[PDB]
Amino acid sequence: QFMGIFEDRAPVPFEEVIDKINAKGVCRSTAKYVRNNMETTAFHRDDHET
Amino acid sequence: RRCPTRPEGQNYTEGIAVVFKENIAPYKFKATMYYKDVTVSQVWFGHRYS
């Protein structure tokens, strides 16, 4: 059973928009962003950055 | 002088008419929604409050 599903939208940083998405055509698997006055990072699949 | 007489006059065809305009109203019908609100609440019970 689901006890809860926290869904959020995080911005893609400038250094990821230019250097990753626009240059290589890929996106990082980790979201590092400021939410509720705190720096939070989420790793996809609870794995390493890819 | 030989001056002209009254014009011929318009010939009118008596009849019946129905005037249709473009349809803009959406097609409406009756539907039924079956669903379930699943609400799972996490409560922390303090000393004097919840």
- Mutation to test the A interface, candidates B37, B39, B40, most A Cβ within 10 Å: B40
Which residues does A10 contact at the CB level (< 8 Å), separation at least 6? A31, A33, A35, A42
Structure tokens given for B50: 């919840």
Q: How far is CA A38 from the centre of its chain?
A: 14
Single out the residue of A45, A15, A39 nearest to residue A27, CA to CA. A15
Spatial separation of the C-alpha atoms in residues A49 and A39, rounded to whole Å: 17
Q: Which residues 1-50 of B have a C-beta within 8 angstroms of A?
A: 40, 42
Residue B41: closest C-alpha in chain A: A3
Please, which residues bridge with residue B28 across strands?
none
Spatial separation of the C-alpha atoms in residues A25 and A44, rounded to whole Å: 18
**Would you say A20 and A32 are in contact if contact means Cβ atoms under 8 Å apart?**
no
**Would you say A26 and A50 are in contact if contact means Cβ atoms under 8 Å apart?**
no
What is the number of other CB atoms lying within 10 angstroms of the CB of residue A50?
11
Residue B42: closest C-alpha in chain A: A3
Task: Name every chain B residue with its beta carbon within 8 A of the beta carbon of A4.
Answer: 40, 42
Spatial separation of the C-alpha atoms in residues A34 and A28, rounded to whole Å: 17
Structure tokens given for B22: 């473009």
Half-sphere exposure of A11 (CA within 13 A, CB side): 7
Residue A1: closest C-alpha in chain B: B40
